[PDB]
Design a protein around this ligand. Structure first.
Ligand SMILES: COC(=O)c1ccc(N2CCN(C)CC2)c(NC(=O)c2cccc(OC)c2)c1
Ligand SMILES: [Cl-]
Ligand SMILES: [Cl-]
Ligand SMILES: [Cl-]
Ligand SMILES: [Cl-]
Length: 303
């Protein structure tokens, strides 16, 4: 009915705002990225700092794992993405093509591809092996805030400050759908685990669950504050079925997915919680905050 997330660890080390936290698909690791130009790896269960991965010339907005938990991709203000071998810490490829800040990135399920979104208003599809750009989608007319592959990688969902959420056929690069809604900036977008729904944040303090096939809004989640930052949200699926998001009032919000009620609010951070991640098997949340805080928090619940 209601989760009971409690603080287990506070992870200090970043020297500027943290931008993104992600659990490795194998559950073993947390990766974090920051305005400090660094990627850090931490033990998911003991919160133990593992290593720092460096190479970007400017700050990093996003980081994402390959399906085998061996590779990471990062998205940076230096206009590049970098592909990293986590075990060695080495940059395997630098992905060059965007003409401004890169804000978001993801591997596909196979992990032969990377998708990216940029201030330059494009979505790019990259070949992991060669490090070359396969497709450039003229996706939006303002900065791209988020990009995400569906369950099998056949679709890409993108969001933008232009107020649109668009769905793309990965193979052809063709737009399959623009969600019909007002047009406040769409600050975040993610497919549901089954690929049927899309969770979308807009900068009017609102999260929406969309039915992809129908192009219809099914659920709305409110009560939090989100009018300025591109705050990441999540489907929590290991215990109760929740929606999880950071907020500009420094809290982590948790809603019941079906009823839309706020079921928990997590207090502790001292700046905007820009990023949250949900562990793939345990009832564990990671959260991260902006420059007044600079820490990552790990929380655990019984359900
Ligand atoms: C006009 O659009 C933007 O300026 C913009 C959009 C999305 C961003 N992301 C996208 C990915 N999230 C995980 C983090 C926030 C970000 N990145 C950040 O807000 C951000 C936060 C902390 C550190 C950081 O270092 C570059 C960047 C910026
Ligand atoms: Cl496809
Ligand atoms: Cl689902
Ligand atoms: Cl789908
Ligand atoms: Cl997650």
């Amino acid at each position: 009915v209601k989760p009971n997330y409690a603080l287990k660890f506070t992870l200090a080390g970043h020297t500027k705002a943290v931008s993104s936290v992600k659990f490795s698909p194998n559950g073993e690791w947390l990766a974090s990225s920051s305005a400090d130009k660094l990627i850090k790896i931490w033990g998911a269960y003991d919160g133990k700092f593992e290593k720092t991965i460096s190479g970007h010339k400017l700050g990093i907005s996003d980081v994402a794992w390959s399906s085998d938990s061996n590779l990471l991709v990062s998205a940076s203000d230096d206009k590049t993405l970098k592909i990293w071998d986590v075990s060695s810490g080495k940059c395997l490829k630098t992905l060059k093509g965007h003409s401004n800040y890169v804000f978001c990135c993801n591997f596909n399920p196979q992990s032969n591809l990377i998708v990216s979104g940029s201030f330059d208003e494009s979505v790019r599809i990259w070949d992991v092996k060669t490090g070359k750009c396969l497709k450039t989608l003229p996706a939006h007319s303002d900065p791209v805030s988020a990009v995400h592959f569906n369950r099998d990688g056949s679709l890409i969902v993108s969001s933008s400050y232009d107020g649109l959420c668009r769905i793309w056929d990965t193979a052809s690069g063709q737009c399959l759908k623009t969600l019909i809604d007002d047009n406040p900036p769409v600050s975040f977008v993610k497919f549901s685990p089954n690929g049927k729904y899309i969770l979308a944040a807009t900068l009017d303090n609102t999260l929406k669950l969309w039915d992809y096939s129908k192009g219809k809004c099914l659920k709305t989640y409110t009560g939090h504050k989100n009018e300025k930052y591109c705050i990441f949200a999540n489907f929590s699926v290991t215990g109760g079925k929740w929606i999880v998001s950071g907020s500009e009032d420094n809290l982590v919000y948790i809603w019941n997915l079906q009823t839309k009620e706020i079921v928990q609010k997590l207090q502790g951070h001292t700046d905007v919680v820009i990023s949250t991640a949900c562990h793939p098997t345990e009832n564990i949340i990671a959260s991260a905050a902006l420059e007044n805080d600079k820490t990552i928090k790990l929380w655990k619940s019984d359900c």
